[PDB]
Symmetry: D3
Subunit: 269 residues, 6 copies
């Protein structure tokens, strides 16, 4: 339904108190977090991370929000990573973990540079829609640092072990077509259409149930995150269980102050 998918978008500002980001919510349930430091190619400082964390937590808790977009202000940079001129030092690890465990899809909308710490951010997002002017890569080894967490292992789950080793060991830059060919982004679109198409992808997700998306994200995370992934799966299993008769017999027994009785339930194969 292209009319629906490409219908205009109505953004409402929710940036009060924020210095380094914009936070906006659409009427049809997309939240957008925008890194707003274009003069340093949207590099994050610890303050910027703090604000993103708060913005993301809000979006996670807002039942009107079904999908989150992460992006950079302007056309030239998504995020260039940590600010080199120096709310603590490595708080971006918290943010990474927050994106990871967020029960709603998070979409990186990338124009221009997604580099270093900013490249790991887009990879952490469930999906990435890249503009044709997008540029990708790591810089760690070039400037004597590294991300050996999800920035390494999860990257390898996206593009394979050979490419991951290439990306990190050389620290080259890769354009949008290259990113696309190695499986690094989901699609490449003309710069002028970047949000239009990103919003279309969001609305296609919004057609599916929130619970289904939550279960699917947890299952895919679970292939990577061991017991932390199992814990995500179980939380969803607990939520599902509460919505069934058998999972309500506990509470209903405690209402009528009687001992629970599970004898009336089928023992399925």
């Amino acid at each position: 339904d292209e009319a629906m998918l490409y219908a205009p978008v109505e953004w409402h500002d929710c940036s009060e108190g924020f210095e380094d980001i914009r936070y906006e919510k659409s009427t049809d349930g997309i939240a957008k977090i925008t890194i707003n430091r274009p003069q340093v190619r949207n590099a994050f400082r610890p303050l910027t991370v703090k604000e993103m964390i708060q913005a993301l937590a809000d979006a996670r808790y807002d039942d009107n929000i079904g999908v989150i977009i992460l992006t950079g202000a302007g056309d030239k940079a998504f995020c260039s990573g940590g600010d080199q001129k120096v709310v603590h030092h490595l708080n971006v690890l918290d943010f990474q973990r927050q994106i990871r465990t967020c029960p709603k899809p998070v979409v990186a909308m990338v124009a221009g540079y997604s580099i270093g710490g900013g490249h790991v951010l887009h990879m952490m997002c469930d999906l990435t829609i890249a503009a044709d002017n997008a540029i990708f890569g790591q810089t760690g080894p070039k400037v004597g640092s590294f991300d050996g967490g999800w920035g390494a292992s999860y990257m390898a789950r996206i593009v394979g072990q050979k490419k991951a080793r290439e990306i990190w060991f050389l620290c080259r830059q890769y354009d949008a077509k290259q990113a696309l060919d190695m499986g690094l982004v989901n699609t490449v679109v003309p710069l002028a259409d970047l949000e239009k198409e990103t919003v279309r992808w969001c609305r296609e997700m919004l057609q599916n149930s929130p619970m289904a998306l939550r279960c699917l994200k947890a299952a895919l995370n679970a292939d990577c995150d061991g017991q932390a992934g199992l814990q995500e799966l179980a939380g969803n299993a607990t939520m599902l269980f509460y919505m069934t008769e058998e999972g309500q017999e506990g509470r209903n027994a405690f209402n009528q102050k009687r001992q629970p009785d599970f004898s009336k339930f089928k023992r399925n194969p």
Copy 2:
């Protein structure tokens, strides 16, 4: 502890029709019991025994009156002393025990040895008689179980003990098994079935969906994507329960 209920007599009905090597019985309150019936060879299994255990366990899984399965051997001297369709069909039976959404309880008197030892380990719980004897024999007899018999064993008793069990192939008495965490409890032989049934009945009073989910969650810590498949299966069944 409503022990009068827990310790009440059991109404067993026979379902052993067509089986040569095993007995298969069901109780009205939801226990199925699969008994290896070859006491002359200390309840060692052949491919036929295994084929029949697979049938009986598939029957118990599909009977919605059955909540818990008991695996055991005939008589007082042997749970199962190892292996004598095809040669290694016990591997199928291991998988089937593992993925059975119902608790499976090994009720062990005397020898649980070799292939027979792996079987009791595969069961969710083990209730042992004070005359129970445990251990592997593979390396002593030119064989080994490097599957769940190795790795899953380590998840029960720890890497040091697992290596001891496999490399030396000693026998271990009931107290030794208890102390290393190999079995869940030791009871006097005369009370073996009585306590086993009490344990089954305590589980039968609990949410069967809860047990099913928890068994898969605990398996998921070992079985990688096969474990995740179990969890996803449960999430689906939960959803179709609305």
Copy 3:
């Protein structure tokens, strides 16, 4: 060479008593399981699953069969998903995984939803140019709770797997091939012809090496369950060695085994 590989195939019917599928075997060792409900786009119901489980176990135990083909009747659909209990398909999926013989999905037209997970569980997928792939259904149950997801990510990678599940788009044969979902794409008219060639290439090779490698590749995904498969092959091999046989012979004749006769390899 091409002469052998593209020779005519002689199918013998083994469909006796099956309502929802056809089951056939070639003289040269290929078994073919065909979902036979093209009137409903080859969607399966619990009976279809039960029959397929039966057919597969037959193929597994048939010492003349080396490779299994799974496919749908007609040209329009491989399998469009589900609607002998409600979720027995999950058992059939595991039986495919643990089958010590290669299983090949032969896909024409739709491979959708539960039907899409099916082709993915197969070791290889041969796709016709009219093939269409994708997941479906807004609700958890229509996703089977993401049953299939982790393994799909081992095929197409995490970004594309999240795309496939979260948006539920459809993909054509070229798109499937470019992301690694299928092994090759061939003209619809050449589908069986190419599939049989692929099967015949596998049939030329060591069946024991095939089962060991399949178990080995599964073991990267399936934790201890994979170790059980892989180790069970080692045990099967060990029994076929002299050191294995000395240990057994000693136990029978009730003596101590002399293993010193065998070298302690480094």
Copy 4:
């Protein structure tokens, strides 16, 4: 070290301002204590309780004076009996990823959700009156998360299945024998021994402790554990000369030059 040092009295300083369900206290030698303060309901948590615990634990993580955190319940009869009558999953992760040791100090009941919380703490010091168990399946609930798999890494697969499938209660001696708690002490000595254990860890390198905690989580938590462990490697690297060359070169308006560093074996 010194037993006199280890068993010196402890001066708790109240930090509970704006908390309704919990008390939060700090000692001068570096211990934070979070007490569930609902003894009337056997220290069960309601969502407010969990919310305040998250806050306090966040505070403690950020207080450079704190090296070790104690989680406990008020009075002598209960540590935590689980949810009243899903932010607790958030609190569980927060305990897991806290770079400082977290010690469950258990008197009486640690039950249901309250049992998962003690297991999530790095160490458990149990009083002789302590009772442990799950209740989920008895009451139509279950924790298939860390409550299951991590439990199995503590007591083994046979015991974890028994605990979950039957939902019995276990006394302190039983918990100790299956490796569920670290030590059992007389109830009167519970805090005295716990503070001793905390002070022992406080004597050690905090960096070493956080690296080890991450290393141990990493045996359970796949790439999430790698993230914790690699995060620490990255932090350490910043404290080395080679790790500062990047930042130095930039501040010196020049190209990084790593040729000046050893290429170790």
Copy 5:
């Protein structure tokens, strides 16, 4: 991109003394090159070849002037065609040694990389392939198999469907097919093989060697369970010793870590 530096001539100093099956050479700017030198038998390895390769690689590892290693075959027709038709299976030790080597190892491939030879190139961190390169396994064809990193690790490179295809059918794949499935990092004209390989090597050589070893361990740790944890944590242990807090522990008089910040 300083292509003058990157494409500058390279001078190999010979370190091959005492080697029968291989050549071992070093450049001044820090590249070690191990060349399988059995072109009579298409560069197939025997136990002695493996033993020498292990020696050469251990030398590269302990040479503080070496930052990257190139593994390659002599001549233009074969990188390595596999095992000859320490001990028999010693190639397994070489594979582990490539894996735990704290310096990048690059397979430079011309012509055949087949069988045990194909697993060799996969074990290397990167593979630069000539346009005449050919890849594939042969195990099932000749009744053997590599079920180790030869199977699982291949799957982390090309994906599960492709890995099953490669092993089950044992076809050969040309340079473009290898590139399209992510099996090699790049494909260049045969005449430029060493030129491009040296450029890639020089690019890594400009970067932090500590950073590279840490990321290599981190990437291995996604496959190798506790063995991966050992490498990763071993690097952490090494970094920790280089800090004041680590050094204070050594000097400790009982140690005092009170003067160090408890970071969040």
Copy 6:
């Protein structure tokens, strides 16, 4: 088995030539013994020690007459008190080497097994402890740690609660505490340490060496991801070469014909 056999005298033959920091000996019934010989420093290892141990273990591995290795310290007071604090971390190589050795490696511990020395006993497949044995880490006290197998693998031995205790507090534990937590396999009187150790080795030596290497790899595989699969699969490969179908490849090459697998049976 026969206790007369198991407790027969043991005869150690010296193979220590060239070694400065260790002794290395072999018995004729197939046991190699590597003894850290620095008792004046409680058998602490320095890099030289580790290098010699690696060399000795490599020899034990390639010696077809050796089926089991004992790792031990000289005298009665120490197994190994850890890294000598007076290349740098070559002990990690030794750790991997103990791990991937296809023969059982048994730690024989009298007195202190501490720090890096405590990780060494854990790496061994089995540990036989004397009644005077003492165990524990020290890293955090002296500003260091082993977060590799020293942490994760210890957790597979004692469980996550005890592992955290051991590492976070760095206490010492006696032989009884060690046995109770599953850290050692058995505790024996000091005077019988070698006697019982040699008994255990001889029990293993009666079993199939192939079965033992396969099981060791299988048990490593529960911990070591693809590195463990490499070991396990490497054994499968070796087993395959000893079967007729596994020999067809080489027979076909020798007889100058294409391999033919049609003549072999398929199994379910």
